[PDB]
Amino acid sequence: MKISIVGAGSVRFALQLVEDIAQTDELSREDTHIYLMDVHERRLNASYILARKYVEELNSPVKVVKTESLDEAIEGADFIINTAYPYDPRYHDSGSQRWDEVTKVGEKHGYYRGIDSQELNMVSTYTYVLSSYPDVKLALEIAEKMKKMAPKAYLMQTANPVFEITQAVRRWTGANIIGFCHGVAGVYEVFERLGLDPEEVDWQVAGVNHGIWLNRFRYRGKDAYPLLDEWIEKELSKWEPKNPWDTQMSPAAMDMYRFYGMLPIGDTVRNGTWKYHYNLETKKKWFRRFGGIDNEVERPKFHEHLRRARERLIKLAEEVQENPHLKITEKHPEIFPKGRLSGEQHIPFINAIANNKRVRLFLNVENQGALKDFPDDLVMELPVWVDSSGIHREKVEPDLTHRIKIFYLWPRILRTEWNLEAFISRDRKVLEEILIRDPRTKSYEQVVKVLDEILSLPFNEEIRRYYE
């Protein structure tokens, strides 16, 4: 089989994908070809060398290939993983650096954390100038190529905005796309914090990408929510975040639980109303110490760490290339483990589809009735069981609460429709209309000016012309 990783320049992630493949029995065979593709020659090479080296040390028969041709990566593929984050190397070092520059423009026009930060949509680098033109455009191009050169492949969309893109591709191309995100892993924080063994809990989450809720939580044959209530009464007050990313049991999470009736899970906790996000001091009240990860201090700090980690991997690539005796699985155990899968859903999905290794996943697929009061065709993030017969929606029960539907999911669904409309219409009036619905907007003149300046940045030339 042929597994293609588009955007392999994202080195650490591409490596953890390869590692997961080489460590998976059913997939660790001679006829498993992994194609690594990216336009960035040096980042691609670093992933390539560290990937081949890793499989050699693991003694895995898997073949690793690299290429700079999208078409070559796609042709005849069985699985295509889209993790690309387009950017202009003349102006920026990465997509996240471009997002950061635009965010700063927004901030000077009075939009704290940028125009792309909206109610229920605070997750950083999720959308770009609202309609995410570069990311949607690329996914659509991949989807259309896949329909002709790889008619049986799954497009595994990991690049953001996952919700908008999966929905756009489905609606406009009919391509075989499935959105992947792993905010569901926040549920293990909850179990731990409450002193529960994960394998003794009967749970389910459902909702929308970065918008999922613990609809079922049961322990020793009963509702386990009373246990959370106890923890809130006794432990919430003294809760402290272990790092900027640590929000699952935060005051914001529990305030949302109090209102909605179920606990928001994972990135859902980041995606709250402005109640929790007005400014950095408000964020520190609701997430404590760091103010979470989506703020002016922590986010640029995170991106810088990413950049450095990547540059270390590139250097390490150089090392192994000159000293073929280097043992990376010994030198750097955390980056190159041998008994530890990443925990990411991508490779289990592949093993499930190809090899009938049945597993429960949480993926962005069309609703088709799983959630009542939502359209069949709406892409949602659902519990599904996957095997070689395909993707089977688990019955969602109990249902999501009324408040979650009317106050959280529906408003998020409408924003998806607004962002999609902003992309397809090529109409600047839609971009304006979105900002007019933005609580931070104080005047129409403000809306016009922030968009004028953002669309006039030199690296946004194509986007500016698109809306002209």
Q: Would you report the helix, strand and coil content of the chain in percent, each value rounded to 5?
A: 45, 15, 35
385 binds, among its own copies, Mn ion, none (CB under 5 to 8 A by kind): none
Sole window of 64-72, 87-95, 166-174, 402-410 interacting with its own copies (rule: CB under 8 A): 402-410
Instruction: Tell the smallest beta-carbon distance from residue 274 to its own copies (Å).
Output: 7
For residue 181, the minimal CB distance to Mn ion (Å) is 3
Q: Is 182 labeled as catalytic in the residue annotation?
A: yes
Strands (E), 344-447: 359-366, 379-387, 390-393
Q: Does 273 bind its own copies (CB under 8 A)?
A: yes
Quote the CA–CA distance of 370 and 374 in Å, as a whole number.
Answer: 9
* Site membership for its own copies, residue 274 (CB under 8 A): yes
Single-letter amino acid, residue 333: P
Q: Which amino acid is at 246?
A: D
Distance CA 130, CA 33 (A): 37
Give me the least distance between CB of 31 and Mn ion, in Å please: 31
Asked if 172 touches its own copies (CB under 8 A), the answer is: no
CB closer to its own copies, 403 vs 426:
403
Please identify which residue in 100, 119, 135, 366 interacts with its own copies, judged by CB under 8 A: 119
Distance CA 368, CA 419 (A): 22
Query: Among residues 33, 182, 387, 427, which one is catalytic?
Result: 182
The b/e string for 147-162 (b: 16+ C-beta within 10 A; e otherwise) is eebbeebbbbbbbbbb
Is position 386 an interface residue for Mn ion (rule: CB under 5 A)? no
Instruction: Select the residue whose beta carbon is closest to Mn ion and give its number.
Output: 181
Cα separation, 190 vs 171, in Å, equals 36
Q: In the complex with Mn ion, which residue's Cβ is closer, 128 or 219?
A: 128
User: Are 413 and 378 a contacting pair, CB within 8 Å?
Assistant: yes
Compare residues 104 and 429 and give the one whose CB is closer to its own copies: 429
Do 16 and 49 contact (CB within 8 A), yes or no? no
Residue 443 interface partner, choices Mn ion, its own copies, none, CB cut-off 5-8 Å depending on type: its own copies
Among 18, 37, 150, 181, binds Mn ion (CB under 5 A): 181
The DSSP bridge partners found for residue 156 are 81, 178
We find the least distance from the C-beta atom of residue 323 to its own copies, in angstroms, to be 58
Break sites following residues in the chain (C–N > 2.5 A): none
- Which residue number, 275 or 315, has a Cβ lying nearer to its own copies? 275
Task: Map residues 127-166 to x or -, x wherever contact with Mn ion holds by CB under 5 A.
Answer: ----------------------------------------
Choose the one of its own copies, Mn ion, none that binds residue 181, judging by a C-beta under 5 to 8 angstroms depending on kind. Answer: Mn ion
Neighbours of 230 (CB within 10 A): 11
Q: Which residues have CB under 8 Å from 417's CB, separation 6+?
A: none
In this structure, are residues 65 and 2 in contact, taking their beta carbons and an 8 Å threshold?
no
CB contact set of 347 (below 8 Å; sequence gap of 6+):
17, 20, 21, 24, 27, 341
State the minimum distance, in angstroms, from the CB of residue 358 to its own copies.
Answer: 36
Site for its own copies in 342-381 (CB under 8 A): 373, 375
Considering CB distances under 5 to 8 angstroms, the limit depending on partner class, which of Mn ion, its own copies, none binds residue 151? none
Which stretches of the chain bind its own copies, using CB under 8 A? 119, 258-259, 273-275, 278, 282, 373, 375, 402-403, 406-407, 410-411, 414, 417-418, 421, 429-430, 433, 436-444
Q: What are the catalytic residues? A: 182, 267
Which stretches of the chain bind Mn ion, using CB under 5 A? 181
